[PDB]
Ligand binder design. Structure first.
Ligand SMILES: CCCCCCCCCCCCCC(=O)OC[C@H](COP(=O)(O)OCC(O)COP(=O)(O)OC[C@@H](COC(=O)CCCCCCCCCCCCC)OC(=O)CCCCCCCCCCCCC)OC(=O)CCCCCCCCCCCCC
Ligand code: BCL
Ligand code: BCL
Ligand SMILES: CC[C@H]1c2cc3[nH]c4c(c3C)C(=O)[C@H](C(=O)OC)c4c3nc(cc4[nH]c(cc(n2)[C@@H]1C)c(C(C)=O)c4C)[C@@H](C)[C@@H]3CCC(=O)OC/C=C(\C)CCC[C@H](C)CCC[C@H](C)CCCC(C)C
Ligand SMILES: CC[C@H]1c2cc3[nH]c4c(c3C)C(=O)[C@H](C(=O)OC)c4c3nc(cc4[nH]c(cc(n2)[C@@H]1C)c(C(C)=O)c4C)[C@@H](C)[C@@H]3CCC(=O)OC/C=C(\C)CCC[C@H](C)CCC[C@H](C)CCCC(C)C
Ligand SMILES: COC(C)(C)C/C=C/C(C)=C/C=C/C(C)=C/C=C/C(C)=C/C=C/C=C(C)/C=C/C=C(\C)CC/C=C(\C)CCC=C(C)C
Ligand SMILES: COC(C)(C)C/C=C/C(C)=C/C=C/C(C)=C/C=C/C(C)=C/C=C/C=C(C)/C=C/C=C(\C)CC/C=C(\C)CCC=C(C)C
Ligand SMILES: COC(C)(C)C/C=C/C(C)=C/C=C/C(C)=C/C=C/C(C)=C/C=C/C=C(C)/C=C/C=C(\C)CC/C=C(\C)CCC=C(C)C
Ligand SMILES: COC(C)(C)C/C=C/C(C)=C/C=C/C(C)=C/C=C/C(C)=C/C=C/C=C(C)/C=C/C=C(\C)CC/C=C(\C)CCC=C(C)C
Ligand SMILES: COC(C)(C)C/C=C/C(C)=C/C=C/C(C)=C/C=C/C(C)=C/C=C/C=C(C)/C=C/C=C(\C)CC/C=C(\C)CCC=C(C)C
Ligand SMILES: COC(C)(C)C/C=C/C(C)=C/C=C/C(C)=C/C=C/C(C)=C/C=C\C=C(C)\C=C\C=C(/C)CC/C=C(\C)CCC=C(C)C
Ligand SMILES: CCCCCCCCCCCCO[C@@H]1O[C@H](CO)[C@@H](O[C@H]2O[C@H](CO)[C@@H](O)[C@H](O)[C@H]2O)[C@H](O)[C@H]1O
Ligand SMILES: [Fe+3]
Lengths: 55, 55, 246, 307, 43, 281, 55, 55, 55, 42, 46, 55, 43, 43
């Protein structure tokens, strides 16, 4: 019995980690899309001045 | 004049007294602020000058 | 007047902004107390008055004179449910859920809940029934979109519950309120137009499996529906989103 | 997905609705218009009838003369050329009198006399439309909430075009009639008064403007979410609270710890929108009369860092 | 009666308490003003 | 404490995550798994703003300002006192906003209502992420985001706008303004109309929705109806925010010049560019 | 003067007492803030100068 | 004066005691903040100068 | 003093204990932050100066 | 009595509550004493 | 310590283990991101 | 002290243990971030200087 | 007596386990403070 | 006392599993910390 219980506890924790990972990795993929697009646009040539006094 | 009391048969005294109270307070505040804004009638500055209370 | 202050930095713009804050505090007090005309006083979960009632006192009662001799509503006034609630406590302490003691769909609790509204129809401005079957509405016809009449009605189990036999329409607002569905046994039911998806060859109901359609509450007369019956029907159909079996 | 109730699945049409009679003089109603099946996907299909009594004649004819006066000025600026008229349409402007004319009426037609004439037609048009909103409510026995709400919009419009120019002592302060020019006036006004973001009443007016989008997003979404229970029949929910109003109240109670009623949410609605232009008009009226540099005023009132 | 439903005797009773509070509050305020005036005349 | 009608609705279930573990109320507030998350992120972000005020050296809440990293950091993490606190607070804000939306979803599920409200709130979140996340990472630096401070975020708006001249000339910004102004108009009319019907002249009966239709038909010749006005108010608000996000995500990414110069494409259409007179000839 | 008790037949004492308490507090706060804003009457600055407490 | 107990027949003590508690705390906080805003009465600055704790 | 226990017949302890807990934590936090904002009382900066941990 | 506590329950609950208040304030007094000896604020 | 097992009579273990998986993953990610943002410890720029 | 166990007659441990878990993790995370933002106690920054890891 | 439905004996039992957790947690915290104070004294 | 429906014996057994894997997880973490400290001491 106990190996089944051990695997069940591990599986429940892996479900939480898997969702937290999937959301995190999906967030990074969305960030990477906007990064790739921004690298393709003429932004590097036409870089805006800093809007904040912090520079 | 003697019939002026009949106004309370036309105007509800609750509404009149509230409207009168709001009216008289705001009018009073306005006049005091005008006098404080007027250097010749700011009683705090006048007494300060009279008693040499600054510098 | 630029730079003219009564004292310190207290400008005529300063007077204005401080006056607005006092006005806004009074207005928010007015708005919140006006919004306390329903649901208050607050209750303990046993139904007794709660020891805490919050910082705003109740407003003075107001009376609505209802149209068509339907009488008067005065609010705030004595709240009561006036129906059985089949929920029991899950915990002795407050703040926990109350579990259904029977079938929540039949009992009309949770998302299946309904309110004891007037058991009379809603009336239009002239005093006629606001909602009528379109076969009884003199000039009414489907003017655009897929006519649903005669389509099969598919439950979310993907099995056919019945077929559409009429539309019920809001006469003054000229819109479809319900579909009347004839069931397998030849009795009819009303399905809210907002809870069905009309498709080219079917009407699909996501909220109910085909076995639940018989349990939809019936109307007591075939030509009109009361506000009570509307609440019972709409409550039950929406309850199926939580309680319909997988 | 399930049905979202954003566009109707089936339209139905019946005999046209001529409306409630009450104390309305029915001779002043038009007939019913056509039914738009395109509009019937989103709202009602029926167009008309419209009521056209004495103040409506005054308002529409005065408003027409306002619009026509600007139009003929634009055709003149276009040199009567239809291609130039359409090319430069957003660039044409009927401008107020120059500063040296003050509040006087002596300015030439090209130099702001036509702007005064157009503004007179606008003044009559708007105010007679206000009385129209009041009297249409009166004849149906309704509360005057619409006319009083509209008075808040008129308050900002009056400040912009009339009251602030008089207090400042010249018509040149008023807004030019023109698409890009009134935008340019809006930008120039802020630059002259030292950044209008630091006007606290402009800040409040923005808060209420954003609050109006917030509140109508909330209220519109709420009523659609309970529309499966008849929630958009709000007056009947006010007269006889159904599960629609209870579920709406509890969603917000469980979300944010407090809620409205079906009547009282419309009291939040009216005041949120009214406060946009009420605070707006105060903020503009203070600008140049009381504060000529709002950033420096902000520095002296603890809202911007000192130099 | 009036709009509030207080009887004439209830109104006389409440007014008598209210006015004693008003006199107490204003008596303290008079002493405060006298103390400040002697300390620092504003005329 | 319950509203007098509330008890029949406080049933188990509808949760997305956690089952019964968090399925309870704290006074009026429903908790759930995302209520725990929302409170943690909100409290942490609030306290980190207060700590940023300690570092800044001000307790005036109008002067408190958490600036993003300088442009020299690009998209890297900065020192906490030099913009790393803005990074953590932005993560907290995003965590709180998303948790709040997901908590509204399970409240919708428990009450059996439609999802329109959390869907509508997601537009506000995506507008926020446009200004702090999507546009800064397209432009390659966190320093293009706005600072968290009551007046200082308005300095960011001003400085960002005047980078492109008068920002009124942004065409998507014009559209967004038109939806914002139209929404406030519609809200005023809708509030007034319902109140004028429920609260008639003294001693009259409540007006019906037929009177509501009649008033607007008499006034403008059209009435959108009771369902249509709530559809309208939602779509006006959401369209305003959608075109707001669009007007910014194009600014500094595909458009770089003074926005007033864009409108010359119409003026210089070849079939009328050379015709003398007018304003542009 | 004697008949003024009849005001409590016009106005609910609850509403009056709350309104009066708010009114008196805001009035008092305003007057103290005026004097603190007034250099000749800011008692903390007067005592600072009297007892040589600054720099 | 002896009749002032009748206020608890006018006003519910639950609201009064909550209102008073909030009022007194905000009043106390206000007065402490005013003194901390005053260089002659900021006790932290006074003790800093007294004990030569600055620089 | 002897009768102060009757507060619990007016206010429910479940609400009061929560209100008190929130109040005392935020009060304690605010005082510690005030001292950390005060150079003469920021213990982390005092100890840096004491132990010469800055350069 | 709004809360439904009896007078005896209110007495018992208050006595335990006050022992909590005294303990918490005694720890605070020792904390103030330590910090005052370390760095006086008067 | 011997009675700490009674936590599983207060909180449903299935739900706790899922939530703990979320907590531990997010905590770990936070710490790795703090070290990547640290020039002395960013193991991708070494 | 001996009667403090009666707190579990007032609050259910499910709600308490969740509130405590949020509180303790919030407090710990906040204190670590306060120290990481402080040059005298940022251990990652202290170690980098101690072992000359920068540049 | 209680709002929670715990008996007095159950409230004692639960408190004894809770206080064990509190003392365990505070004990390790004291060790952590001691280590840090030795490494880098504050005050 | 029980809100979860586990018996006392079920809770004892499940806790023994959870603790064994908690110790193993902490042991793996200790090894990772020791490896990193040897590589690059953070004290
Ligand atoms: C003219 C251009 C100018 C700008 C002017 C902008 C005005 C905008 C007004 C918008 C009002 C919308 C709300 C509303 O309900 O409207 C309909 C309502 C009722 O319609 P009805 O047909 O007559 O009656 C129907 C009947 O069934 C009853 O309906 P209902 O119950 O819904 O009505 C009661 C409402 C209406 O009350 C009001 O409208 C009051 C409006 C006050 C506006 C003040 C704004 C400017 C001052 C602040 C600037 C601040 C910054 C400077 O009841 C309420 O809404 C109550 C609101 C309570 C607010 C309390 C605030 C207290 C603050 C003080 C606290 C002190 C504590 C010590 O109409 C009215 O009652 C009349 C409204 C008159 C508007 C002001 C007209 C101009 C006044 C100034 C010039 C003339 C006097 C000198
Ligand atoms: C949207 C495009 C611009 C922008 C441009 C402007 C301009 C221009 C103005 C404001 C104004 C405001 N802005 Mg801004 N602002 C933006 C992003 C934000 C965000 C955000 C998380 O994205 C927030 C919370 C705020 C917050 C605010 C308020 C300080 C103020 C009133 C808003 C309001 O009533 O809205 C509608 C919402 C409601 C009516 C509900 C109540 C909202 C309350 C008042 C918000 C309080 C925020 C609080 C002070 C911030 C700290 C949070 C706490 C730590 C918990 N801004 C971006 C960068 N904002 C105005 C102002 O007065 O500034 C001083 C102003 O003039
Ligand atoms: C560079 C530009 C300046 C600036 C300068 C100004 C100026 C100048 C003004 C505003 C004003 C406003 N500003 Mg600002 N503003 C800036 C930045 C912003 C930003 C931002 C994100 O940066 C925002 C959101 C706002 C927001 C706003 C609004 C809150 C406010 C207008 C309310 C309204 O509905 O007016 C529109 C509504 C009206 C004018 C009312 C109209 C009513 C009349 C009766 C309608 C008649 C119709 C007519 C007859 C035709 C009908 C024909 C039909 C076919 C039937 N500002 C910067 C700092 N702003 C106004 C205000 O109130 O300031 C306090 C104002 O005057
Ligand atoms: C509380 C603040 C908000 C507000 C509220 C508000 N506005 C209102 C109301 C309210 C409550 C009304 O009751 C009133 C109304 O009737 O609404 C339907 C109104 C109104 N708000 C209006 C506009 C408006 N509101 C705005 C804003 C706001 N309104 C704020 C956001 C804005 C802007 C810029 O933000 C505008 C432009 C109008 C639709 C209406 C007022 C109508 C009016 O006064 O009209 C006078 C002019 C005319 C009647 C006609 C003008 C000329 C036209 C070209 C018609 C010509 C007809 C002719 C027969 C044809 C000619 C053809 C030839 C030339 C070829
Ligand atoms: C998309 C259309 C409009 C919209 C819709 C909308 N907003 C919504 C909803 C909807 C449908 C909700 O359901 C939700 C709600 O519950 O409303 C009461 C919400 C809401 N809209 C809000 C505000 C808001 N909405 C705004 C805008 C809009 N909301 C759009 C115009 C604005 C502005 C500036 O325009 C504001 C201020 C809240 C009242 C609420 C969301 C509450 C929430 O997220 O709660 C959890 C988080 C907290 C309690 C606090 C988090 C604190 C942070 C961790 C720290 C602060 C960081 C922040 C970046 C600092 C900024 C400083 C400023 C000076 C810049
Ligand atoms: C821009 O141009 C400027 C402003 C510079 C110059 C232009 C100014 C202009 C245009 C000015 C216009 C002025 C006008 C038109 C003034 C009109 C004044 C009037 C008509 C005043 C009337 C006053 C009347 C009063 C005070 C009456 C009071 C009455 C009573 C107190 C008693 C009421 C009756 C009662 C109580 C009896 C009731 C009986 C029964 C049976 C119930
Ligand atoms: C800018 O301008 C400045 C500010 C510079 C100058 C201008 C200042 C102005 C305009 C000042 C205006 C001041 C005014 C109008 C002041 C008015 C003051 C009043 C009217 C004060 C009244 C006080 C009354 C008090 C304190 C009464 C207290 C009463 C009680 C304690 C008892 C309550 C009654 C009870 C318990 C009886 C209940 C009875 C029964 C039967 C149950
Ligand atoms: C503002 O600036 C800063 C932050 C730098 C300075 C200020 C700091 C402040 C104000 C800090 C405040 C700190 C406070 C309020 C700390 C309080 C800490 C407490 C009260 C901690 C308590 C911990 C308790 C624990 C870990 C208990 C654990 C218990 C268990 C594991 C067993 C529970 C019982 C079980 C499992 C079985 C029960 C069931 C049956 C059937 C018997
Ligand atoms: C800006 O101004 C600054 C901040 C600079 C300076 C000013 C600061 C100010 C204005 C500070 C004000 C501080 C105040 C008002 C502090 C008040 C503190 C109090 C009243 C604290 C009370 C603490 C009480 C405690 C910790 C009680 C605990 C009780 C228990 C643990 C036992 C509860 C009872 C039980 C379990 C018995 C239950 C019985 C039965 C039968 C079930
Ligand atoms: C900003 O501040 C920073 C982040 C820089 C620093 C502060 C950090 C803070 C505040 C950290 C807080 C950390 C905390 C509270 C951590 C708590 C961790 C705990 C309690 C972790 C427990 C994990 C337990 C696990 C993974 C147990 C799993 C057990 C099983 C899966 C049973 C199955 C059997 C196994 C795994 C044995 C398998 C082996 C064989 C041979 C069969
Ligand atoms: C196709 O061609 C035709 C000619 C057939 C038609 C074309 C028409 C066209 C192209 C019309 C164009 C209209 C435009 C572009 C209108 C733009 C209007 C805008 C943007 C207005 C914005 C703001 C206006 C304000 C704030 C005006 C306020 C005015 C007042 C408050 C009036 C105050 C009254 C005054 C100054 C009159 C004082 C004088 C006397 C004698 C009493
Ligand atoms: C929704 C939330 C939005 C805000 C999210 C913010 C997340 C921030 C994550 C940062 C991740 C680590 O980011 C890391 O930062 C460091 C430190 O600046 C950068 O490092 C950069 O600057 C340092 C000096 O400052 C140089 O020594 C280094 O060579 C250079 O690359 C790394 O190139 C980058 O990989
Ligand atoms: Fe509505």
């Amino acid at each position: 019995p106990k190996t089944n219980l051990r695997l069940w506890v591990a599986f429940q924790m892996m479900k939480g980690a898997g969702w937290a990972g999937g959301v995190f990795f999906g967030t990074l993929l969305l960030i990477g899309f906007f990064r790739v697009v921004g690298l393709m646009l003429p932004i590097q040539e036409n870089q805006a001045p800093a809007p904040n006094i912090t520079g | 004049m003697s019939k002026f009391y009949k106004i309370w048969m036309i105007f509800d005294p609750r509404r009149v007294f509230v409207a009168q109270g709001v009216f008289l307070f705001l009018l009073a505040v306005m006049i005091h602020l005008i006098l404080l804004s007027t250097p010749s009638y700011n009683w705090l500055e006048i007494s300060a000058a009279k008693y040499n209370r600054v510098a | 007047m630029v730079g003219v202050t009564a004292f310190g930095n207290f400008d005529l713009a300063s007077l204005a902004i401080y006056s607005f804050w006092i006005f806004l505090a009074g207005l928010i007090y007015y708005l919140q107390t006006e919004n306390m005309r329903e649901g208050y006083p607050l209750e303990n979960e046993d139904g007794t008055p709660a020891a805490n009632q919050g910082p705003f006192p109740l407003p003075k009662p107001k009376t609505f004179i209802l149209p068509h001799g339907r009488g008067t509503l005065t609010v705030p006034g004595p709240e009561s449910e006036d129906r059985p609630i089949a929920l029991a406590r899950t915990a002795v302490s407050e703040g926990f859920p109350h579990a259904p003691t029977g079938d929540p769909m039949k009992d009309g609790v949770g998302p299946a809940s309904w309110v004891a509204r007037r058991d009379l129809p809603e009336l239009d401005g002239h005093g006629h029934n606001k909602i009528k079957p379109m076969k009884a509405a003199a000039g009414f016809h489907v003017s655009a979109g897929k006519n649903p009449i005669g389509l099969p009605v598919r439950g979310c189990d993907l099995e056919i519950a019945g077929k559409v036999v009429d539309i019920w329409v809001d006469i003054p607002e000229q819109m479809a309120r319900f579909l009347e569905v004839e069931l397998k046994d030849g009795s009819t039911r009303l399905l809210p137009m907002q809870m069905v998806k009309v498709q080219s060859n079917r009407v699909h109901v996501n909220a109910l499996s085909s076995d639940l359609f018989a349990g939809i509450p019936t109307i007591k007369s075939p030509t009109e529906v009361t506000l009570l019956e509307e609440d019972k029907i709409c409550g039950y159909v929406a309850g199926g989103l939580m309680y319909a079996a997988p | 997905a399930e049905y979202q109730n954003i566009f109707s699945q089936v339209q139905v049409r019946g005999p046209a609705d001529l409306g409630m009679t009450e104390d309305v003089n029915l001779a002043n109603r038009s007939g019913v218009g056509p039914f738009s099946t395109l509009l019937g996907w989103f709202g009602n299909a029926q167009l008309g009838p419209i009521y056209l009594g004495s103040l409506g004649v005054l308002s529409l004819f005065s408003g027409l003369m306002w619009f026509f006066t600007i139009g003929i000025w634009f055709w003149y600026q276009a040199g009567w050329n239809p291609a130039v008229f359409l090319r430069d349409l957003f660039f044409f402007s009927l401008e107020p009198p120059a500063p040296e004319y003050g509040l006087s009426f002596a300015a030439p037609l090209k130099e702001g006399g036509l702007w005064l004439i157009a503004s007179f037609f606008m003044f009559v048009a708007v105010w007679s439309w206000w009385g129209r909103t009041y009297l249409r409510a009166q004849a149906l026995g309704m509360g005057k909430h619409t006319a009083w709400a509209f008075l808040s919009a008129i308050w900002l419009w009056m400040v912009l075009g009339f009251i602030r120019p008089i207090l400042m002592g010249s018509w040149s302060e008023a807004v030019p009639y023109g698409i890009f020019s009134h935008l340019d006036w809006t930008n120039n006004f802020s630059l002259v008064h030292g950044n209008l973001f630091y006007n606290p009443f402009h800040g409040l007016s923005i808060a209420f403007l954003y609050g109006s989008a917030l509140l109508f997003a909330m209220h519109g979404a709420t009523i659609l979410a309970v529309s499966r229970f008849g929630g958009e029949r709000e007056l009947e929910q006010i007269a006889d609270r159904g599960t629609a109003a209870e579920r709406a109240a509890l969603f917000w109670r469980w979300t944010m710890g407090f809620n409205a009623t079906m009547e009282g949410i419309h009291r939040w609605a009216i005041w949120m929108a009214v406060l946009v232009t009420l605070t707006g008009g105060i903020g503009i009226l203070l600008s140049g009369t009381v504060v000529d540099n709002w950033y420096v005023w902000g520095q002296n009132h603890g809202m911007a860092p000192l130099n | 009666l009036g709009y509030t439903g207080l009887t004439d005797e209830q109104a006389q009773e409440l007014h008598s308490v209210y006015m004693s509070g008003l006199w107490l509050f204003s008596a303290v305020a008079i002493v405060a003003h006298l103390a400040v005036y002697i300390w620092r005349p504003w005329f | 404490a319950l509203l007098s009608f509330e008890r029949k609705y406080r049933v188990p279930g509808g949760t997305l995550v956690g089952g019964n573990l968090f399925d309870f109320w704290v006074g009026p507030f429903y908790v759930g798994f995302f209520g725990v998350a929302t409170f943690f992120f909100a409290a942490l972000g609030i306290i980190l703003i207060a700590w940023s005020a300690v570092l800044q050296g001000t307790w005036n809440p109008q002067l408190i300002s958490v600036y993003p990293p300088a442009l020299e950091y690009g998209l890297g993490g900065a020192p906490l006192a030099k913009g790393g606190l803005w990074q953590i607070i932005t993560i907290c804000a995003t965590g709180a906003f998303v948790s709040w939306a997901l908590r509204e979803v399970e409240i919708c599920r428990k009450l059996g209502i439609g999802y329109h409200i959390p869907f509508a709130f997601a537009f506000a979140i995506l507008a926020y992420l446009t200004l702090v996340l999507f546009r800064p990472v397209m432009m390659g630096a966190w320093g293009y985001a706005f600072p968290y401070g009551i007046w200082t975020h308005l300095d960011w708006v001003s400085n960002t706008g005047y980078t492109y001249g008068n920002f009124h000339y942004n065409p998507a910004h014009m559209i967004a303004i038109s939806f914002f102004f139209t929404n406030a108009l519609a809200l005023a009319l809708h509030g007034a109309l319902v109140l004028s019907a429920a609260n008639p002249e003294k001693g009259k009966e409540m007006r019906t929705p037929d009177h509501e239709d009649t008033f607007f038909r008499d006034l403008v010749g059209y009435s959108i109806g009771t369902l249509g006005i709530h559809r309208l108010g939602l779509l006006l608000s959401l369209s305003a925010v959608f075109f707001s996000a669009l007007c910014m995500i194009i600014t500094g990414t595909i458009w770089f010049d003074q926005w007033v110069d864009w409108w010359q494409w119409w003026v210089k259409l070849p079939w009328w560019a050379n015709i003398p007179g007018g304003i542009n000839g």
